[PDB]
Amino acid sequence: NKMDRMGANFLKVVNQIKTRLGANPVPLQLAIGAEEHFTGVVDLVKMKAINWNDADQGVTFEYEDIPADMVELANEWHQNLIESAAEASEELMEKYLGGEELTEAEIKGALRQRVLNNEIILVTCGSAFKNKGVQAMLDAVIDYLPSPVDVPAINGILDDGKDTPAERHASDDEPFSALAFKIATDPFVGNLTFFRVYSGVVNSGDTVLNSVKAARERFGRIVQMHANKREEIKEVRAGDIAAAIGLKDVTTGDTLCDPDAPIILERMEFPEPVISIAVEPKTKADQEKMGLALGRLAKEDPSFRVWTDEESNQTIIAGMGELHLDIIVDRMKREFNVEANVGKPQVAYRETIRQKVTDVEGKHAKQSGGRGQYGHVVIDMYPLEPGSNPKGYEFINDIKGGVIPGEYIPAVDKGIQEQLKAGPLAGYPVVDMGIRLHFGSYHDVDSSELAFKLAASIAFKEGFKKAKPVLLEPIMKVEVETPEENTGDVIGDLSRRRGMLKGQESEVTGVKIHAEVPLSEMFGYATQLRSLTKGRASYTMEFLKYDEAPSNVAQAVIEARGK
Amino acid sequence: MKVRASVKKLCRNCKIVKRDGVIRVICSAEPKHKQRQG
Amino acid sequence: MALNLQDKQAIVAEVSEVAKGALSAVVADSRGVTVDKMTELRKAGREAGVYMRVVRNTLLRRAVEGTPFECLKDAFVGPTLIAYSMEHPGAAARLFKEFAKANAKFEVKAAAFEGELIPASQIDRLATLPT
Amino acid sequence: AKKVQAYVKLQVAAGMANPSPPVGPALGQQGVNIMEFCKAFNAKTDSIEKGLPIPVVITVYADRSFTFVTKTPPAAVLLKKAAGIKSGSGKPNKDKVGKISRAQLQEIAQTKAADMTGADIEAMTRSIEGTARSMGLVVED
RNA sequence: AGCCAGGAUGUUGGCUUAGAAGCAGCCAUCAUUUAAAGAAAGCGUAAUAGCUCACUGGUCGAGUCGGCCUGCGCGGAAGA
Ligand SMILES: [Mg+2]
Ligand SMILES: [Mg+2]
Ligand SMILES: [Mg+2]
Ligand SMILES: [Zn+2]
Structure with missing residues (x-):
């Protein structure tokens, strides 16, 4: 399109497709005139010019005489075209190589065939805004594009697979089978599932089986559509696209079919959210109302996810893009209305001793005469290293002086867990820290556990300060692909961020960059990437091992509560 | 440009030219090194 | 430091090394590569000898003043960055061979490697005996 | 090529x-x-x-x-494993910057004179001697 | 002044050792290898390439280069 805009080139664009996407394209219509003077197009079959008419909005047109402004390239590309569609069989070629031109009809049927195998792509040119070219493309949609039965059948999985589990001839006779391409949200019924019947007939009220979800669904109000507008239809034949109200379980891409139909259709693959942000209703307690909305819209987009990570109280919204996540937020303000401001995700820090070791201890005078028992422990701190064990809660039991009561000798590390479990440094949990009770004191009458754990608690507290632990933030193994021209800038940006790198690697269609970057960092990395790479790069985060960082925030977020 | 009352050579490729009496610095390396009046 | 007095001295200090030994060489300044001419003058210093002066102070007038006492052909202007490479055990040794074989490859160019001949009349190489 | x-x-x-x-x-x-x-x-x-x-x-x-x-066998490894002291630049002016002696020089001369050569086998030997000596401290031998 | 061009392959340095790159931090480390090798010049400096710190050889026919003192000038310098 846009052949009515300067810089317009039919020829150049064709090459662009061949040079960049990879497709080999066969011209169908060359162009009559330049961008301002786009009169119309030249068919390489009819050998005519459909100069369209300006007064009517393209409604009328005239097939013309193929003027000499363009009567010579036409011959070249018509000749190049025959050759390619004639490249469908020697029966055409034997006559083609017979020096004789095969009939256009054999070319057009040959054309439809070559498109089916994707051997060739047919290029049509027009200007919709200039109300020209559009009617012919709609004609060529008829000429080469595939009808439902102009290609082979939908295939399937049956009972964990079969020789030909499904070879469903798309027919008004075969058993009902479909796919829900889309689930959309309608506020009055609560859903609208778009389905294409691959093979079958379904009617109002017909039950269907969710092959993927192993369930029963009744199709209440099958409707056809004109975008937003909907027209109810009693039944849908195969090869028809329709929207189904009354369906409540079908995931985008889940097959809806009559019983004994294919369990799995090929559309089980979807992209991964690339941007993450967090959200808050103005009213702190509209959080469920907000929460439900995020969920509904999450059903509609398998690419918008809402997980409220329980590490922090924050509601986290993940999406494929900054617009999406904003288009996904104004929908909440507009439908399922809630007013909400987005922000930053929280910080999943941790801590660990560096190396320091002592024989630290804790003690309370639980006796006082009347109380009757006491508990006291001498402990011994060590770290392991950042990432040597799967069991971060490492430990060694030693005690042979003041050997606390036996029935809970081994039961005196799990009660201590509740310090390694969360928060000793700035409200963040501990990894790899090793505790070692060696001495202590007790008396084996009833050495009270709940008031003996105060010894353990002050043991952790005092032990922590002496041992000088550290704080290690989350840092992952990012992997990026990009064109081999933006390497300098993408790595410069990673360098601005606190990112180390991994792989001196260059792909063949690009370059695979590997980088270790923080997790609190890279907020909105995707959009920065697109900006500096011309929206032609992908990436991933692998949640790699945590690493330490000098941070003015780790202490200001606990000095927020001061002492 | 810069109308500093004291133009100087900020780089190595700066030149001092005296078009119209006005003493100017013109640098064909960095255009931020373009000054007007000595 | 190629001043006038240093020239008046090094003219004879470079005539002497080629007037007591074998023919010397000369290598132009067109294109030395990170490997080819660098490591080639390396192997030149290695095999040819640790006395060759690959430097060039070969001005036309300095040559006519210093070198032309004997072998006056040096005086004629030479457009070369001479890589003066003599030879120890007789005339036309490995250094001369390497220069003559480098004038066509394995270097930028060796300026045809005319060299110094006491006779100064032999277009042919010194293999006059049939042997 | x-x-x-x-x-x-x-x-x-x-x-x-x-x-x-x-x-x-x-x-x-x-x-x-x-x-x-x-x-x-x-x-x-x-x-x-x-x-x-x-x-x-x-x-x-x-x-x-x-x-x-x-x-050839790189002098960077020759003078850092023929040394014992694996140090070098950076802490060469305070303490041992690694070991370098005439024995290590002879080793590198007879070893790395195959392909990493210069204006002599002995000249690349002096190359390895420089890569061993300019560490900032050398053993006296 | 104007013109024919040449800087490592011990050398992610033996390096704050995950290098920070034959020209990030960095110590210093001609490092013969030379019309040349600095482990640092603007380019990518975190990195090639293709112009290239530095340096010189080749050209080319009379002056050239910077300072210091001094005279007289120039800008700084816009009001009813
Ligand atoms: Mg004044
Ligand atoms: Mg004035
Ligand atoms: Mg003014
Ligand atoms: Zn400037």
């Missing part, structure tokens, strides 16, 4: 062949993969530096293959 046109020094010297992971993705321009990553260095990376510094060139030529007359 060209001299290395990919000088990107992000390779741990010796150790693992093609040690990209520690080295950083900041030298990504070169197009080496699992085809050229175990062809020649994997099979001739033993008798030069086995756990020492032997800086690898970035040679990737257009013979549709990777091969060249590789250098």
